[PDB]
Each structure stands twice: as structure tokens, then as C-alpha cells.
């Protein structure tokens, strides 16, 4: 039901990949997010995960519902507010709190 995942970002030049992408956010339309449970579900989900990526390694799964990011509340946020929480340049370890 509720799992805490800690991902260790992979260095590749000036980049640090997470091996997964997200979808959702209050600025998005729940019907385009193949994971939302309904039309009100404006949450952030894990729509994709790379194999061997540092996400999968950590335990990240497809559809996973991110309620947290390094402790930050991602329940009522925009897609871009979330992607920004994850892709911080000055952070190599990101922790997520998800349900499944």
C-alpha cells in the first residue's frame, strides 16, 4: 500500500538521470494521465520507468503515486513544480513517498 523509495541519481556529465518520468499535477487533465483513478485525480504518478535505471533499482514501479519528494508535499502541485523537485541539480539523492 504505502512505500518509501530512495533513489540515487546517476552521474553522466552535468546530468543526473533518475530512470523514470512522471505525469499528473493540478495543471494537467486527469484523463491524459493513464494512472489517475478519476476526473478529480490531479496527482503525480510514475508513468514510466527505465530498466536498470536508478529508480527501478530503488524500488520505483509504474503507476506508483508520489505523495512526497525529499519530504515535500506533491499532492496539490503542478507537474512542473514536481519535475523541478526531482530534477534539482544540487541534489543527488531524492526520496519519494508513494502508495500503490
Curated annotation (Swiss-Prot):
Task performed by this protein: May regulate a number of protein-protein interactions by competing for PDZ domain binding sites. Binds CTNNB1 and may thereby act as an inhibitor of the Wnt signaling pathway. Competes with LIN7A for KCNJ4 binding, and thereby promotes KCNJ4 internalization. May play a role in the Rho signaling pathway.
GO biological process: negative regulation of cell population proliferation; negative regulation of protein localization to cell surface; negative regulation of Wnt signaling pathway; Rho protein signal transduction; Wnt signaling pathway
Listed name of the protein: Tax1-binding protein 3
Annotated signal sequence range: none
Annotated ranges, domain PDZ: 4-100
Keywords: Acetylation, Cell membrane, Cytoplasm, Membrane, Nucleus, Phosphoprotein, Wnt signaling pathway
Record's keyword annotation contains Cell membrane: yes
Organism classification: Eukaryota, Metazoa, Chordata, Craniata, Vertebrata
Residues of the full protein shown: 12 to 111 of 124
Amino acid at each position: 500500500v504505502v512505500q518509501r523509495v530512495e533513489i540515487h541519481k546517476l552521474r553522466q556529465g552535468e546530468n543526473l538521470i533518475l530512470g523514470f518520468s512522471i505525469g499528473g499535477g493540478i495543471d494537467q487533465d486527469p484523463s491524459q494521465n493513464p494512472f489517475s483513478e478519476d476526473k478529480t485525480d490531479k496527482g503525480i504518478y510514475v508513468t514510466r520507468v527505465s530498466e536498470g535505471g536508478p529508480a527501478e533499482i530503488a524500488g520505483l514501479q509504474i503507476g506508483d503515486k508520489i505523495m512526497q519528494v525529499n519530504g515535500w508535499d506533491m499532492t496539490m502541485v503542478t507537474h512542473d513544480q514536481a519535475r523541478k523537485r526531482l530534477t534539482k541539480r544540487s541534489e543527488e539523492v531524492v526520496r519519494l513517498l508513494v502508495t500503490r
